[PDB]
Design a protein around this ligand. Sequence first.
Ligand SMILES: *Cc1c(COP(=O)(O)O)cnc(C)c1O
Ligand SMILES: *Cc1c(COP(=O)(O)O)cnc(C)c1O
Lengths: 399, 399
Amino acid sequence: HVGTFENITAAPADPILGLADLFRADERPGKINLGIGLYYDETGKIPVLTSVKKAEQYLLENETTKLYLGIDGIPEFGRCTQELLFGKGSALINDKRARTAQTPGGSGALRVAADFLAKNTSVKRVWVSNPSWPNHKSVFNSAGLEVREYAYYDAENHTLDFDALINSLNEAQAGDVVLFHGCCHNPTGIDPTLEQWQTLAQLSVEKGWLPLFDFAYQGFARGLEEDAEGLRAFAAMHKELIVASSYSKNFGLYNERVGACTLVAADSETVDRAFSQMKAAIRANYSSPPAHGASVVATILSNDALRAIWEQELTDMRQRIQRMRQLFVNTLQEKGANRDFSFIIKQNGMFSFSGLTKEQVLRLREEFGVYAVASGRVNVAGMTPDNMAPLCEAIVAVL
Amino acid sequence: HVGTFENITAAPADPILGLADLFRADERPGKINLGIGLYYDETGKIPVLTSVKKAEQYLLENETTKLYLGIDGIPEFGRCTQELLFGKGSALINDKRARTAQTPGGSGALRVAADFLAKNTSVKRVWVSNPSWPNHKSVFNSAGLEVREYAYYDAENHTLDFDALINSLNEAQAGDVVLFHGCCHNPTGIDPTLEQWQTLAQLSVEKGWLPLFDFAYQGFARGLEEDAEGLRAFAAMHKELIVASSYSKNFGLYNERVGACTLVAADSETVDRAFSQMKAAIRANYSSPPAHGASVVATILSNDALRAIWEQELTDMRQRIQRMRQLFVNTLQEKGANRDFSFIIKQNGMFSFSGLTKEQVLRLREEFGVYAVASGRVNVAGMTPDNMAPLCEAIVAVL
Ligand SMILES: *Cc1c(COP(=O)(O)O)cnc(C)c1O
Ligand SMILES: *Cc1c(COP(=O)(O)O)cnc(C)c1O
């Protein structure tokens, strides 16, 4: 008999995660990793937050069992998540229109939404921005959903091309899903203004779209409440929406896989009925979510003292990235760049579409040991006072 | 616009997890949970193992980062998994014919295998024993695979109907997947003898089946090495096979979601090519696996002193279940059963088919607060010296 695995075509490496393998293999001294979206501190390390360590100590001392969580996870984690997304006193919460499942990261939240939609609704099509996080297409395709792209980025002016965004969504139909990044658009770092969010909210209502928010960076643009303004403008107007959120980056809990999928419907009876099918889709995947990471988050958010520590740690991360954005622009000029990079200061979050070509990104890797994503996305949070001058000399050399 | 969620029909309750919800809400103080497959100690608690607490203390004081694991998880966890499954010095390992991905539980390993098969091969059907774990059908169906049943249990004699098993499987074609439980068949507790395993292995290569082992109870039948004899008899003869294993039960790590999916192919080139698509299917699901539970397992297995403690804790669990099986049989006779229950002694693991009808199981819940699965599966590890008498009085009262 012929093997089952003989006709298999190899898959290419992931455009983001395969960078770690390449970077690890590189033996050139002084190599610089600007690839995967991790926060690095001023010394080039990826630390555990103090608030996380304190919560983990409390769990070690007080956990008496590891028995399975329910399919939807820790109840307190869901409640705190809804307050973070929608605000204390939100009508969505008071009216019991929202249900939340704890999931394995924002990635798992996106997949649970995809499986739920494909199996229980007539949704056939998901619209994502061009560019977006490369894994968006893969997640929705895995459930057999068609993914279409809408225009987003003005690569000439380095701004949101709002006119092209509106025009390119003209053919998104009632019952299609439209995916929005809540803040810190990945990869461009360009977000709608409040007025633009409000314009999109009124348009989505009039066209009948089902909005899906990917919210992986709450707190990295301006602050926790401010970064949720766009989502909340949508929530004030819509009967239905889905939020896939992540605590990987804003708690530094990447490898513990802490996220949430929140379903919002017109009333409590409808969302409970829908949520029962979301739980069934979880049961047929990983059954129930991992406790440790979500327990840490729930502990921090429900303790005033730990929460205050965490909020300051998040402010410190946000502020260090902003300083690095400015230092990057200044050092590029110092090192002789004639191209104007001041648009980088206007972008939010960990990244920035640098405008480098694929050929320039490959050259940076091969000749200089500097690792960026082939799209030109560079992780500003990977820049430090110590590596800034060599990485700017490298960029200037490939321009 | 009519809502996308308006017409969703509610999902039925999970036959196992829905019963756990009912049990939790039940206000009667004498209620007894013989449903979901958790290990209870002699005092009716579900404890954290001492080896696990020690490993967690080491992690708390030595972890410096939560940066993402690779798609396939902790390398040492994969190596230790392969050794446990195939034994040190296995040709499969020395020939580099196996690749392992760390997954969120055995459940996650099953879905990853299913997605991988559905999207990258010509496999269309999966053969499952009648009866089996209720969630097998859901996992495989949700990946798009047809599920077929083969005969297994003789309910009159409470034995393995080996002739019926072989006869029913002659309808399975080359290229079909056949699912075997490695040991401690769920729900019957009836496993093949080594001779029967070897007969099935020979038939499997002759017929061209792709074997998939669900290995959730290694160590609970006879021992770690002994419980893998059946799997190793297949591994000696087959070019290809898949193992989905779980550390939920044999480490008491249920809610941290620790399992593995292991691929075996004819040679190193083929398994690496197939594993590249397995990683792509993981990336489009939860991206990368949760670190805490797998780190605990890897720490225990890679440290001689911790491993010795763990092996003794697992032996104690296995022997406690064996004592409860004997006590259950003896106590039924004293309480007046007048019916042979001696077949309970011959069954392995947590579960036995009690032979009770669904009406009897329903009476036990409603009138006596004793919770079993509607199939009559009872969790012997939920029995204790303190709840044995009331349990058995309740059973005698419904016979
Ligand atoms: C990081 C990220 C995710 C995935 O988050 P995880 O919690 O790591 O799974 C999803 N969407 C975007 C836009 C991200 O940046
Ligand atoms: C427990 C069990 C599983 C699931 O394992 P998890 O690690 O809890 O996801 C799968 N198959 C069988 C037969 C089981 O008993």
